[PDB]
């Protein structure tokens, strides 16, 4: 209206002086992450599994197997998760580190109760299931991962590649993840255990996705992320996902860790990355601003992914003209509704980089589009208020 | 205007009562799929090929080779297509089931008239082209697929891996798809046919995409989707696509099905998934509502992909104020133009899951954006009508 230190933009008349404004934007502050109000938020994979990480649960560590509660919203904290100690593993030679983050994307996750393969009847038999006391079970003694069976032949000879088929062994509509691997040691020890001293070749096919691996015999890297025990050998661990009703095929040679108890999961869980522990309660979970409580319809700052009762990002501080018409369209602007953005829940940081880059490009473009729409709406509203 | 049981929304004044409205939305009902009006719609791959499926045509079945008519709009009916019966195939060990759906995305599809490789001059010669009476040709007798040549060596010895190059053998600008595979049987039969009883290793490279395969000798899964004949062995079949002017490389051992007649195709065909048979005529093809005839500019319901003279999805039942200005605003809203959304036509369901998930995410985001724009337009229009 008349002269005043408050200015508001209009779609047609541009800048104009008004005798009071109602701010609609606020810049938040980075804060810790809190439990989402009204939804059970997944932090640690198994909260009641003590002294175990997500990779320990995913690989089935002997002393921390337990039920994984279902969750609709989940938090990603470790981009490169680590183990808390069992038989040493070459983590970087495969894609195994992303398995906990893959299971994090499924709402319902459970471990099978029956073995999908009878390890004593697999080709290359007779087998004896060896074990090592690197990671022990409930009673102090030798153990191994619950999702594998270290098969050591009773007859010590070299073999040609052998084939085994992994069937679908749980309810339809649940994608099944099969975890397998192979074990290698130095020359004399492999000559004593398997009867041959040459590298062995492994491969696996599932849904048209094929991988190939060759073992190493000799100098090994120093043990890392394991319960400190002097051991001369170490294992390579991989996983393959099978969809509904689809079987898998594995070709192998001496030193195979045959799968025993597979993970198969269903549903979809909203995944956003953050940090632990979850402290308190928050209306919205912002990927860069931590746990935020919604107080105003819009916010200004660094745009990022969010889950929950969140405000909508804008690029400039918007103001609504002031001084029942003002209240009539104040709720209308506050009642705008936009769908939220999350990770793809199936695109891994290590494996799928171009897809994630395209995803962030789409996120930025949508942010700009909705910001422009909101600015146009605010100009229309306050232009109507002024007139 | 005055008091009335009809209410309309406005961008500025909010809810307002008017004496009559013009509905702009309608909820369709699920119906069968109909031929698209004005465009030749592709259903079956070869409609005049009787007693044959899409995979039978793609693999080149002896008794139903025929011309594939060109089409701009195509229908996908089998997510996991099956064969109607020839020599048994290990369907799930490769990506072969998606070949008909890959050919479905090309407007012009044809089979070559000359062999891209002279099978009798390939490395490992002398060869004799073996054949089996599992699927016969026009006159009852032994035959085989038109896109392969089962090369059985005349000299029965084991061989080291051999290399052959697949040249570009059709018009430039047409992507060429090469179909190849290998054959395996049990121990004594392979010792009698090929001279060796060890698994054979195969690989192929094209455009930097490489696959590796190892054959199986011994227990085979039960025959499925074949013309019932007792066969002790079965084959694995794969395909590789070469772009314009690019050759391919194949490494192989005993038991190779060398390519003979490749598919090369050009153009782009709009692919939407549905069900057969096509009954009648429809203005628009909705992926979930079947064949729909456009009657109103907008519709409310489950948003999905559509091809043709289709209405635009909205989330709420919009209404237009009533009671020549009204007529002018009705045509303007009815003449809005939005381009339609289809499948990627190159992303396979079995192989590319993250890309399809990102595609559906983009689909939903565009649906929300367009719905918001349409709602804003309707509020502006009826606000102008009231004033």
């Amino acid at each position, epitope marked *: 209206s008349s002269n005043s230190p408050h200015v508001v933009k209009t779609a047609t008349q541009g800048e104009v002086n008004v005798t009071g404004v109602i701010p609609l934007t606020t810049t938040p502050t980075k804060s810790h992450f809190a439990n989402l*109000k009204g939804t059970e938020t997944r932090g640690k994979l198994c909260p009641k599994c003590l002294n175990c990480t997500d990779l320990d649960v995913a690989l089935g560590r002997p002393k921390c197997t337990g039920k994984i509660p279902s969750a609709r919203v989940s938090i990603l904290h470790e981009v490169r998760p680590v183990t808390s100690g069992c038989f040493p593993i070459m983590h970087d030679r495969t894609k195994i580190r992303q398995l906990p983050n893959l299971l994090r994307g499924y709402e319902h996750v459970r471990l099978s109760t029956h073995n999908v393969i009878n390890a004593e009847d697999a080709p290359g038999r007779p087998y004896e299931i060896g074990t090592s006391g690197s990671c022990p079970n409930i009673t102090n003694g030798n153990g191994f991962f619950a999702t594998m069976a270290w098969a050591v032949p009773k007859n010590k000879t070299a073999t040609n590649p052998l084939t085994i088929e992994v069937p679908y062994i749980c309810t339809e509509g649940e994608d099944q993840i099969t975890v397998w691997g192979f074990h290698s040691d130095n020359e004399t020890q492999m000559a004593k255990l398997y009867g041959d001293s040459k590298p062995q070749k492994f491969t696996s096919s599932a849904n048209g996705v094929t991988t190939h691996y060759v073992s190493q015999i000799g100098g090994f890297p120093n043990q890392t992320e394991d319960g400190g025990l002097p051991q001369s050998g170490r294992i390579v661990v991989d996983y393959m996902v099978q969809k509904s009703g689809k079987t898998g095929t594995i070709t192998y040679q001496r030193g195979i860790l045959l799968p025993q108890k597979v993970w198969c999961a269903s549903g979809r869980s909203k995944v956003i990355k953050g940090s632990l522990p979850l402290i308190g309660e928050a209306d919205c979970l912002h990927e860069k601003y931590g746990g935020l409580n919604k107080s105003k319809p819009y916010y200004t700052g660094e745009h990022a992914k969010a889950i929950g009762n969140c405000p909508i990002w804008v690029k400039t501080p918007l103001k609504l003209a002031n001084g029942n018409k003002i209240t009539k369209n104040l709720n209308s602007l506050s*009642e705008l509704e936009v769908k939220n953005l999350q990770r793809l829940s199936g695109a891994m940081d290590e494996l799928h980089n171009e897809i994630l880059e395209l995803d962030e490009k789409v996120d930025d473009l949508r942010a700009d589009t909705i910001s422009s729409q909101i600015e146009l709406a605010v100009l229309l509203s306050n232009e109507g208020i002024i007139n | 205007s005055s008091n009335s049981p009809h209410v309309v929304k406005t961008a500025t004044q909010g809810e307002v009562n008017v004496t009559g409205v013009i509905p702009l939305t309608t909820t369709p009902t699920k119906s069968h799929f109909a031929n698209l009006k004005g465009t030749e719609t592709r259903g079956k791959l070869c409609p005049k090929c009787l007693n044959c499926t899409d995979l039978d045509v793609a693999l080149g079945r002896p008794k139903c080779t025929g011309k594939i008519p060109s089409a701009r709009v195509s229908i996908l009916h089998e997510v996991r297509p099956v064969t109607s019966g020839c020599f048994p195939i290990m369907h799930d060990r490769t990506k072969i089931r998606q070949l008909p759906n890959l050919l479905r995305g090309y407007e012009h599809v044809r089979l070559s008239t000359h062999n891209v490789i002279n099978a009798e001059d390939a490395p490992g010669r002398p060869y004799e082209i073996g054949t089996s009476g599992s699927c016969p040709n026009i006159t009852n007798g032994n035959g085989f697929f038109a896109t392969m040549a089962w090369a059985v060596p005349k000299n029965k010895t084991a061989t080291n891996p051999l290399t052959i190059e697949v040249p570009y053998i059709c018009t430039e600008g047409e992507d060429q798809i090469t179909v190849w595979g290998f054959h395996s049987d049990n121990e004594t039969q392979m010792a009698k046919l090929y001279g060796d009883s060890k698994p054979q290793k195969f690989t192929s490279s094209a455009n930097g995409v490489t696959t590796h395969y190892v054959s199986q000798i011994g227990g085979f899964p039960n025959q499925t989707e074949d013309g019932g004949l007792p066969q002790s062995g079965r084959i694995v079949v794969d395909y590789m696509v070469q772009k314009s002017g690019k050759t391919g490389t194949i490494t192989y051992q005993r038991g190779i099905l060398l390519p003979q007649k490749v598919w090369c195709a050009s153009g782009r065909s709009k692919v939407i998934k549905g069900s057969l048979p096509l009954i009648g005529e429809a203005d628009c093809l909705h992926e979930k509502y079947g064949g729909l005839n456009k009657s109103k500019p907008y519709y409310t319901g*489950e948003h999905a992909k559509a091809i043709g003279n289709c209405p635009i999805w909205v*989330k709420t039942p919009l209404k237009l104020a009533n009671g020549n200005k009204i007529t002018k605003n009705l045509n303007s809203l009815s003449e809005l133009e939005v381009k339609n959304l289809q499948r990627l036509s190159g992303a396979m369901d079995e192989l590319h899951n993250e890309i399809l998930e990102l595609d559906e995410k983009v689909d939903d985001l565009r649906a929300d954006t367009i719905s918001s724009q349409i709602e804003l337009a309707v509020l502006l229009s009826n606000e102008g009508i009231i004033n």
Partner: nanobody
Amino acid sequence: DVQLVESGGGLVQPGGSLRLSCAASGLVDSANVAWFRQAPGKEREFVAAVKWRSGSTIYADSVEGRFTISRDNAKSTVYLQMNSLRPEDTAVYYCAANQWYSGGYYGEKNYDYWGQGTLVTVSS
């Protein structure tokens, strides 16, 4: 988690009235609640929906000017008032809700929390 329980079903002559009820505990200021129905031999279809915060109503064409939906956050219950029932309305009704706004107000994948169901029969 939230709890959804439906009550008020029964048998009514065609031309009368009926009211349904649904008690929800644990809803937040951004939730949405909807009613469904499934005729025998058919799939569930959208009937109505209201917003837990502002109370905006979305009613399907088949049942409009006759049905109505409302909520009372003081009593934590949502009602469905039925007028001029016809024998084509006989079905099993359901109460559905979600925590925050989803892709659309129609369909079953948009809503996450589902109620057990009540039986409504219309006959002369």
